[model samples]
Target: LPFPYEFRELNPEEDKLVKANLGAFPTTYVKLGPKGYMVYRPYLKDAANIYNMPLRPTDVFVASYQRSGTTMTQELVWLIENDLNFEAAKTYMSLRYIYLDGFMIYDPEKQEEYNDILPNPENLDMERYLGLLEYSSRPGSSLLAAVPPTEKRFVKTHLPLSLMPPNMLDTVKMVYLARDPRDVAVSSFHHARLLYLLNKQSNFKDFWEMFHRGLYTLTPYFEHVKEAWAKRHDPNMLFLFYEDYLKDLPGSIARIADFLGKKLSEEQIQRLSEHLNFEKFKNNGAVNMEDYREIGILADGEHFIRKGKAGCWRDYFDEEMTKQAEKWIKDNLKDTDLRYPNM
Candidate 1:
């Protein structure tokens, strides 16, 4: 809970922000892009250095909107690259870090800019929810810090290409994914509760207001999609949709491997396809985030990976909310090949 920026000095204008919960309103996020720019909301000073970090040809960025299947995305990348390390993936979800108590880590070679506390141990496991691509728990903001592994890093991020290093678009391979924004709102609200990040008074109705406005963390969910949509054709960036994955799970896995230039034997595909599913992850003592309790991030029965369904927004959004969401999405996605199927 000791997010360093929590107590850092801020302008009086910024004071209103720290006191009022962010992500619940428009303009709630701060701008941290280089030279006074804004990429997304919920940023810190470290974000200013994100573009200056070193880039490598081997880097792979698994980018997505929050609640749009990032955990599964990380699992797919880690599972494939680690040769389908389901156990590692499982342990990764369960992996406990000394976070919330906030300390510092020093990695001289790779660390350059300070970051908020995030995931992993030098002892490896599959990377998941806790480790955001930004806030690498050390110094420096190279997207690589956000994306990694010993054998050619498979890092995760929610940033648009513009926010990435100037040369990253040409240098690294990115697996960019989008999802039905309604579903994103449904799952993100649950996530907010699990992490105790959302305002206590915020409920489904409140969430929809903020969500449709693109006010939550890592948002303008609409803009996040559109910005990456522009780069969908980039040879280095692979654009994917959550609904598409639902329709063709195996195909999506193969496409991800192809994008990364990795060859998976039929056996690897079959095994991975079977292993990475909601049922397996949901009850998994490993993937279900038991560590949240140890650190007080979760209450006894609270869950991090709540229902991984893509269209479940139908269950949550009422008539008015649904109509508004449809119109908002339509407006944002208009005149673009990029589209969401859940409308």
Candidate 2:
């Protein structure tokens, strides 16, 4: 509760979505919506409209399990739309991704506008983060779900494809990104460790065990990807593997562009690869996450973009862990034609 964010007794509207009886380890709990919602505080000001958000033929939906390359997907889409302009890619964040304080929860620049007005400004635990970032209002989010877009519309959702409204499913172009769950588990482990409001557990092994069972946030990872995997043939859906993109950036970009119905000129070909290059964007203001350290959520050098390399799971996963993780990945993904290589 010491986190510099607003807190209130959960409203009945929001509380109904919360699952306090998950019986999770170390007090971890979940929400009651979206198959496996992890209760990241149902956002404010009709932000929950994401469930029924309006759709357009030109609207683009970018989805992924969290920390699974959702941000990269956004950048690539931005570049392609701008004729593979890297300058456009770099300037995309004047209002996107990294924010006022740089972190998701804390935006001191915006917080100062409201933090002092809270009941007790002197008390760290008593005070809270109060800003548009907390609510993710329509204008703040990339989606013009309500506003008609002057150009192509871009939206990001962490929700499973199955959970999206039927109207959205039938309309709008969609791209879903999935990563090796082994690495996802690792990234998720760190993500949960520092995400102050989620009430997550810190133990990695515990994280792994619950991960397979779909106990962590936005979970049922298997079912989440499974649902998207089933829709690979959907005319409106483009299901891409993170490893595929990692395996071949240009190939992946071409596939994505083709899916979106565009042609990439040779002049901008490498620019798409440049946009996907991990090093080019990771430490840059685009994804730096220094915002975390400033807000006390992270320590010095505890980066937000930890080890962007693929197959780094091999480093963290040992013999027994690898076997079990591979089992988890396979058991979850076996039914689909999708086979994750080098797992």
Candidate 3:
């Protein structure tokens, strides 16, 4: 029993602490990589494969923690990489951006296990279920095989830089997106319930506690940001803020295009900005992930794309949480220059 990299399950004491609040849908936690970042224990099965993956020079990656602007970044980067071919963009974005670790969530061998938790087991469509899994993590195949060798591949992942393929930044280009943590927690609260990661009975307050403590998958929010931020000066890496994009989308698009070495006209930027606006993107089925609702993966009345705003966290965070969040932000920023937009 060995791993390609250092890996270990949480000791009983650490496990007990997390399950105290996150008992509803519990998975074992593992400290992975040299830094000992906390990750779902299950992902380690595929960790080695993901690390050993050979990337192409033309491949582009959108990396972020959960509920950050990952979806928006993926769509924008994919369109830019493909020369803004809106017709091809019609294909489900799930298919377009090969989610690097998505299959780790819905394991095929655990269908019986899923039957117990999924809301509609009898009506579950295996074809659709398995198809999404294949398109996501591609368990048995090379990620490069998802598309033709000559075409640029779009990849998405929530893993921090430490856990990704070792030569990724050296071999291919990557963009790291960050969002205000308060907004990230609010967005992830709904997303966790949608994915059944949190119990239906859990409230935002409880989720926030777990979030502040780094219990959620791919959390330790500041750590994830720091890893990418430290490498921001690299030729192949770019650090972007979700709030910046929210304020100036056209400018953000142009900045991204320039980084990718793609040129765009003012007219092209205008069209892309319109298509990416909150209202239009929320209604977009291909990128919005409406298909999950049909398959019962998402909770009823819950959406993958919720209100897309920079300061929507105000609606969800109470004064007490806000105070705590401010202190948390201040503590993390004490020695580092990493800053979120004025919110």
Give the best candidate by TM-score: 3
Model 2: ten consecutive residues of lowest lDDT: 98-107
Compared with the true structure, model 3 gives a TM-score of 0.91
Clashes of 1: 6
Which candidate number maximizes lDDT? 3
Error of 3 at 195 (Å): 1.7
Model 3, 144-205: lDDT tens digits are 56578877788888888877666579988999999999999999888877777776667898
State each model's CA lDDT, in order: 0.60, 0.59, 0.79
Residues 183-277 of candidate 2 have per-residue lDDT tens digits of 89888777654433223433566567656666556677877777777788888888888888777888888888888778987556676687566
On the 0 to 100 scale, the lDDT of residue 213 in model 2 is 62
Q: Residue 41 CA error for candidate 1 (Å)?
A: 8.6
Off by over 4 Å in 2: 1-37, 41-48, 92-129, 132-146, 194-201, 289-292, 295-297
Q: Per-residue alpha-carbon lDDT of model 1 for 52-153, expressed as tens digits? A: 556778776777776677667667877776666666665653121112101112222333221121222322222432343223344335333544444566
